[PDB]
Amino acid sequence: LMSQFEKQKEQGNSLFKQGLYREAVHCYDQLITAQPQNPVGYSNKAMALIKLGEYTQAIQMCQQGLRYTSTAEHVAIRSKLQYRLELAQGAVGSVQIPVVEVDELPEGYDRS
């Protein structure tokens, strides 16, 4: 039988294929919460968000997902993520990069 994770994912995909993208995102979120190192939650969520026009958020999800795909075993899913990323980047042209106000630089950052 399908595991709980797999059933949540399948439900998400069914909603996606139905065109219920927001609800799909709601399932994929549970995937990410349960297995934060599993790239599939991020890739699926990014595809749904893209279908919702949430390109900036899609970009963030791809950025997070690709952290986990640097080894050979994940090449296929890597490609998927890279597709979504390039789609979403392409849609927005640019993203905001946050400025962190500090009294001094955190450790590990060279001031020399």
Binding site: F16, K17, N44, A48, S79, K80
Partner: peptide, 7 residues
């Protein structure tokens, strides 16, 4: 049918 499909 791959890139545009969920996994």
């Amino acid at each position: 049918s791959r890139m545009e499909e969920v996994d």
